[PDB]
Paper text:
[name]-68 is a representative of a group of intrinsic chromosomally encoded class C Acinetobacter-derived cephalosporinases (ADCs), with more than 350 variants currently reported. These enzymes can produce resistance to penicillins, narrow- and expanded-spectrum cephalosporins, and monobactams. In this study, we selected a triple mutant of the intrinsic class C Acinetobacter-derived cephalosporinase [name]-1 ([name]-1TM) that confers high-level resistance to the carbapenems meropenem, ertapenem, and doripenem.
However, successive serial passages in media with increasing concentrations of ertapenem yielded the [name]-1TM mutant containing the Val292Phe, Ser318Thr, and Phe322Ser substitutions (SANC residue numbering). In monomer B of both structures, the B8–B9 loops adopt a similar conformation (different from that in monomer A) but are ~1.4 Å apart. This difference in location is a result of the Phe322Ser substitution in [name]-1TM, where the smaller serine side chain leads to rearrangement of the main chain of Arg321, whose side chain now projects in the opposite direction and forms hydrogen bonds with Asn204 and Gln207 of the Ω-loop. This movement of ertapenem is a result of the difference in conformation of the B8–B9 loop in [name]-1TM, which places the side chain of Thr318 (one of the three mutations) into a position formerly occupied by the C3 carboxylate in [name]-1.
Numbering used by the authors: 3 to 361
């Protein structure tokens, strides 16, 4: 183990490992990628009932971090000419033609500015048929494009349209096109039976194992599962897109462009973006209740910040996910767990590790 191996292990042991006992989390995988070198730390149990330890093959649910793959698929479709972000959803989902939702464009769906879509579908919307009925009956409220409200229905519709534009179901868009283009070999929307023994159980607040299939249009919002080595490769592709072939390189760069600004945060496709260096308070504020749950007025970007960093939290439940990268520093970090941990704690631990790593 190199001098870097030891230093990084120590930093991760100092800042992430205590979270396991503090929040009774069965298992965790934490990785750092720096200058094309991976550093992987595994702790605890993949499955409590099986006494299977977390390892490099463990597959974790990504939760909301799944949206980063929806974003990449959309950047891919757009740069192949299959969609334009100025298109509306009825161009592709023909039953939405001549309905009010066909007045919202795809970029506005992908970046949560339709003006009338909340965090979740209404409780009564449970089947694919009911989702279509929901969108046909939809009416706008706030001026389209002017207010951000984080929303699983919003990006789910975006992902459904992306799949329609590529003439494949969304699961196939990821498993047959996007994941292979990124070199990921153990990332899934549907975990195959030959991998079930590697699939971590999620654990609720009562520490019981929980597994559920997605709701309607759920896969683009929270439906991806992946390993720590695969997620480090994904961060590498975001740090060095120029090393990848053009179609996926263009897709990745598309997810890095700021689309509008809310206070100190810039919304890109999937990724949240910040001027580097971002103070700890700026990163914490991006996960305030105000930003997460309320409608916030957006402002057009004058010019993008000159030096940037990017992160995404994978809230949900039965899992904790956090990913962050800094192009200037050629470094990034991934945290995966099989139990929820307060976002505040994920951000603080990653901030301390990244601020201490020697160049």
């Amino acid at each position: 183990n190199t001098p870097k191996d030891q230093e990084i292990k120590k930093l991760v042991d100092q800042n992430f490992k205590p979270l396991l006992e503090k929040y009774d989390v069965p298992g965790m995988a934490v990785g750092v990628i720096q200058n094309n070198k991976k550093y992987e730390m595994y702790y605890g149990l993949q499955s409590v009932q099986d006494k299977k330890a977390v390892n490099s093959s463990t597959i974790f649910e990504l939760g909301s971090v799944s949206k980063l793959f929806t974003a990449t698929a959309g950047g891919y479709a757009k740069n192949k000419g299959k969609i334009s972000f100025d298109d509306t959803p009825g161009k592709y989902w023909k039953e939405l033609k001549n309905t009010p939702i066909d007045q919202v464009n795809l970029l506005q769906l992908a970046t949560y500015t339709s003006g009338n879509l909340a965090l979740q579908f209404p409780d009564e919307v449970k089947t694919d048929q009911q989702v279509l009925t929901f969108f046909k009956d939809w009416k706008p409220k706030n001026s389209i494009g002017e207010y951000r409200q984080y929303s699983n229905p919003s990006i789910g519709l975006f992902g459904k349209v992306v799949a329609l534009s590529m003439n494949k179901p969304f699961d196939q868009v990821l498993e047959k096109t996007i994941f292979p283009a990124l070199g990921l070999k153990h990332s899934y929307v549907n975990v195959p039976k030959t991998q079930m023994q590697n699939y971590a159980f999620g654990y609720n607040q009562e520490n019981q194992p929980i597994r559920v299939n997605p709701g309607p249009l759920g896969a683009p919002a929270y439906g991806v599962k992946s390993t720590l080595p695969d997620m480090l490769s994904f961060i590498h592709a975001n740090l060095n897109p120029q090393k990848y072939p053009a179609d996926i390189q263009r897709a990745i760069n598309e997810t890095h462009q700021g689309r509008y600004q809310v206070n100190t945060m810039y919304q890109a496709l999937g990724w949240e973006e910040f001027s580097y260096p971002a103070t700890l308070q700026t990163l914490l504020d991006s996960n305030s209740e105000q930003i997460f749950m309320k409608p916030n007025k957006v402002t057009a970007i004058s010019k993008e910040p000159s030096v940037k960093m990017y992160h995404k939290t994978g809230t949900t439940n039965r899992s904790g996910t956090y990913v962050v990268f800094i192009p200037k520093e050629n470094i990034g970090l991934v945290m995966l767990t099989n139990k929820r941990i307060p976002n505040e704690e994920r951000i603080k631990a990653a901030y301390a590790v990244l601020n201490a790593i020697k160049k």
